Amino acid sequence: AKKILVTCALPYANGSIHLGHMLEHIQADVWVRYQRMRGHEVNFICADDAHGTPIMLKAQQLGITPEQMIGEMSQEHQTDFAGFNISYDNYHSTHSEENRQLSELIYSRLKENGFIKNRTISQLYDPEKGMFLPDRFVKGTCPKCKSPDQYGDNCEVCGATYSPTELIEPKSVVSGATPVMRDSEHFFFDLPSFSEMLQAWTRSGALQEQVANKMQEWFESGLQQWDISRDAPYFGFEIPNAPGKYFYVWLDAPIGYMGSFKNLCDKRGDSVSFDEYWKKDSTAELYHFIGKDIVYFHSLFWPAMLEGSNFRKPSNLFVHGYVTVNGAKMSKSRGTFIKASTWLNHFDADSLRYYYTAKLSSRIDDIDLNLEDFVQRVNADIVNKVVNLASRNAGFINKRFDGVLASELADPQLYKTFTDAAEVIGEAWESREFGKAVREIMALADLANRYVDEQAPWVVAKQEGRDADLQAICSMGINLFRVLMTYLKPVLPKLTERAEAFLNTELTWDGIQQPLLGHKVNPFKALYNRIDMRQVEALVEASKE
Amino acid sequence: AKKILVTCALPYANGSIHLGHMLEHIQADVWVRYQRMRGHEVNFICADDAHGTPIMLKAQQLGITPEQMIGEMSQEHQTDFAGFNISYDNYHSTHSEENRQLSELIYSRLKENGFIKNRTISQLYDPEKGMFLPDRFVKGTCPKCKSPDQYGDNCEVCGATYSPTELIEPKSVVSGATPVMRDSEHFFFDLPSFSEMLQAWTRSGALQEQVANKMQEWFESGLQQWDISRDAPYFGFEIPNAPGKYFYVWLDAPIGYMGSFKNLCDKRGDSVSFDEYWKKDSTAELYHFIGKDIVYFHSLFWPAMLEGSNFRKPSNLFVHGYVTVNGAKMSKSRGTFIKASTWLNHFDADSLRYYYTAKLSSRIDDIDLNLEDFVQRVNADIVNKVVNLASRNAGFINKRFDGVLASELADPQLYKTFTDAAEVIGEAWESREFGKAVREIMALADLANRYVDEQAPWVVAKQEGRDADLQAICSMGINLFRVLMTYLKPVLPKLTERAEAFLNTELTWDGIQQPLLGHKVNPFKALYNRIDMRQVEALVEASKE
Numbered sequence A, B: 001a002k003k004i005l006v007t008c009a010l011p012y013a014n015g016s017i018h019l020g021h022m023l024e025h026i027q028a029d030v031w032v033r034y035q036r037m038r039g040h041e042v043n044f045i046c047a048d049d050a051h052g053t054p055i056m057l058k059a060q061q062l063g064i065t066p067e068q069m070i071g072e073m074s075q076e077h078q079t080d081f082a083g084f085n086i087s088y089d090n091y092h093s094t095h096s097e098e099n100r101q102l103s104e105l106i107y108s109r110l111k112e113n114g115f116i117k118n119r120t121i122s123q124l125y126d127p128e129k130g131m132f133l134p135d136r137f138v139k140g141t142c143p144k145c146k147s148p149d150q151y152g153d154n155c156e157v158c159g160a161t162y163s164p165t166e167l168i169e170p171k172s173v174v175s176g177a178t179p180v181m182r183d184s185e186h187f188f189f190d191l192p193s194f195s196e197m198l199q200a201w202t203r204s205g206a207l208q209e210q211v212a213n214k215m216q217e218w219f220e221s222g223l224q225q226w227d228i229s230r231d232a233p234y235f236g237f238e239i240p241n242a243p244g245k246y247f248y249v250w251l252d253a254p255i256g257y258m259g260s261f262k263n264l265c266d267k268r269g270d271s272v273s274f275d276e277y278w279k280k281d282s283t284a285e286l287y288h289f290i291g292k293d294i295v296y297f298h299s300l301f302w303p304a305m306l307e308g309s310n311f312r313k314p315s316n317l318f319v320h321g322y323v324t325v326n327g328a329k330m331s332k333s334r335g336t337f338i339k340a341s342t343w344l345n346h347f348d349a350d351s352l353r354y355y356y357t358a359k360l361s362s363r364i365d366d367i368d369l370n371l372e373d374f375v376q377r378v379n380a381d382i383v384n385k386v387v388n389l390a391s392r393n394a395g396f397i398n399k400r401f402d403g404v405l406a407s408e409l410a411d412p413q414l415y416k417t418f419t420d421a422a423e424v425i426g427e428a429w430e431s432r433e434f435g436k437a438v439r440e441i442m443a444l445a446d447l448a449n450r451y452v453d454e455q456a457p458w459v460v461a462k463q464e465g466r467d468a469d470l471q472a473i474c475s476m477g478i479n480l481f482r483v484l485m486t487y488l489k490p491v492l493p494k495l496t497e498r499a500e501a502f503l504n505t506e507l508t509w510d511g512i513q514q515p516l517l518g519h520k521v522n523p524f525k526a527l528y529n530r531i532d533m534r535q536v537e538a539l540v541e542a543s544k545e
């Protein structure tokens, strides 16, 4: 029924995808896949965030154009996300003509509407390289404890914090020259002019309660004008009419969501859907899945930019917490800082997808990848509860009954119990209460396994003229599997494909109301194998390096 | 992909085909034709129901063998159905060796399995003719109001109902002798032994909800043993080992479905498909299209007979309501009791096929042939919405562009809108929501006609060096027609043939994904003409007689 546009945050082009990213893209993909199952028109959009000083400097160090470097990271990123079956409809780039034209448009509209201010500021500058320095590119000795080689606004030996202008004997991280303070004109977005609009939006009840609470802290501290320009030398979009000035990365980044959607419409030759989704009167829904470190940009600057440039604002923001491994922030030294590519050398995508999904909820809370629990959970739930219903029953059907399932359900009441749960489960996928959905699905799997145990096919199989009873029991367990794999289809796309090939049918949400009767099933290899702690040790060792 | 066996009810051999029959055979044929379009192996089976007392007596009155009479009605019936392009794979007879052998088989299996009981009953008998009389062949004076010449169990002057044994001064309709009560041994099928099986089948959710509800009324009233024998003199199959006893027509009639399929396999030299479709372990589907007056036989007696004789049961029953003309039951006196042969003297088959299809749905509801609406609908939808797309555009292509269609689509987006609707439309044909399918198809036809109107070919045609624009517009309307005629191909077989000859291509469901480009089309007579109320008055007058 509805038209929905969903995004994940745009990953920086200067680093590889890691499990932190993966939590977000998996969360979003499960939700998107469920929405497609319910018949909605869904557009899942992402892109690399490819601008900024860090990127410019990285390319220079490497001796290649920033364009070449971002082109390489974009392919690396898309290869990893494809390996996790993240079902984007379009994956584009913030460094694109669509994003350029939209950034220029929104800025001009903001400026014509009075929201752009000019003010001179003073910042540390490298006279040798000939560039202003962001804080992280200034180093020197801490003014408090006199420890040398400290970077930016804080000291990693005494913990003091200070403006980098307080550093003793400051040095440019780029060239080693001594930086000096230099004036520069900057352009500022007048966020404060949207305060009332944003406060109303905050109290709507749409946003998560935790996000709303955070926003009240930000209004209390006081909204400020936002510096949205950077001087040359920069890798980004040049500001119209302002030679040597560029849009700050964060101004163009969220416009990249629009740019990626415009690109998809344009490649499809679709001249109507861009305005249908982004004009102020849209009836389409717009959702952004993001992490808690970037909520300020998506909940205050972004909606204000859209309002101020006559576009619709987000229908909701869906925020998730950080990932932890073994309970702690990811650690390079313990080998728990794991890239997405490295993960796929050791385990399949489905396992991590399942694990994260079993833990996620509609709140913001850190999600822990406990590696010991990961093995125990995947083996218990996937191999032993869900896939077991197929693996314990298929052999008999294929060997004794020519792959044909019985003509009637052995236990129609039990089947109805399973199809009756569809409403609560789909409501849980829809409300992002993933943990709740998995708990309902696994309680059904426990009932189906109890059913099989109470019928004892391993006993019926060796007894007298009980061929009919065997076929009935085994068909019954295979239909329960059909239903469970339907509920899990958003979570486990490749196991789902294997189950559809076995069952000789695509799984649709409504399809569970018609059990498979007098139906041929195919033989199969092994639908899902067990994993073990040896594999996890290998993963951790590979990541240590 | 699948193997599907479809039937319509077997028409009695003692009456000509009328519009009531035609509603059913058209419904079924549209569904069958759609299933063939999707690549399934389909077997559409029917036959005449040729046994029973009414038939025996009719033949006697006529002075010809019952075999001669049924042979004549069979040809009349097949001629009418062929005139409506009802695409049977086989049209056989209940009076056939295949049906005899199968009836004898099923009865013996039922009897060996304990389902056949013997009981003596008493019935009115004609001592002069020497035959038991069914209720309709007894006449006399109503015991309540004393009105003479009343037939059977009810009085057409005071409305009373009674057993014909209550009639005053009873007379045989056959000879005029006074009937007397006489005993006779009869054979009974033990329906009640299948009650639990039938209740489970009822609650499966397969059957239409309205049918399920009706079945609960029947279980509530209580299933009874079914008298399946008739004494001699009879026109039917004699019961093995029971001289002078015959199977009741209704016992052998549905076995006729099997007999017709066996006949088709045997004529094809196919020794495997009979068992592949009728054995208990079949993976083929079996569907019976029937009317609501015969649901008791198809939903209770039939599946019980098949179970009891070790054959598979129906996959589903598809039930339709009655036909009405001008809102009322068909009336001989108003000339609304219309034979199929008479219809074809006045109108083509396609028109009635379209009209019924636009009204049908997946429920049981009477279908009204409103004659005024019939004219208005066929002219509006067939002539003016669908055929118009071809008739308004072909002339230009043939006269100015040598019958050649443009090398590209003028409006690729609009075309994609049409090919994107294929899923919902095919789902509507498949679910028997015919009315919904036609509504989607006509909404597309409205869009295609709007397209042509917005391009105004009648204006472009008279202007400057706009030959290219004209060819583009006209080719575009002809491709939209291609797509619409594809969706309607199950409904309008002869218009479809005319459209394929014009387009120089067979229409296939997948074929719409490749528009006709740089392609030669042929000239045409007139694809479909308008009809008018004068024709309907003629039809009504002819039927009055």
Ligand code: MET
Pocket: A008, A009, A010, A011, A012, A049, A253, A254, A255, A256, A294
């Ligand atoms: C428009 S979302 C940009 C997100 C940013 N690249 C980061 O990874 O935090």
Ligand code: MET
Pocket: B008, B009, B010, B011, B012, B049, B253, B254, B255, B256, B294
């Ligand atoms: C096996 S269906 C028989 C139908 C019956 N001849 C009637 O027309 O009602």
Ligand SMILES: [Zn+2]
Pocket: A142, A143, A144, A145, A146, A147, A155, A156, A157, A158, A159, A160
């Ligand atoms: Zn310090």
Ligand SMILES: [Zn+2]
Pocket: B142, B143, B144, B145, B146, B147, B155, B156, B157, B158, B159, B160
């Ligand atoms: Zn009376």
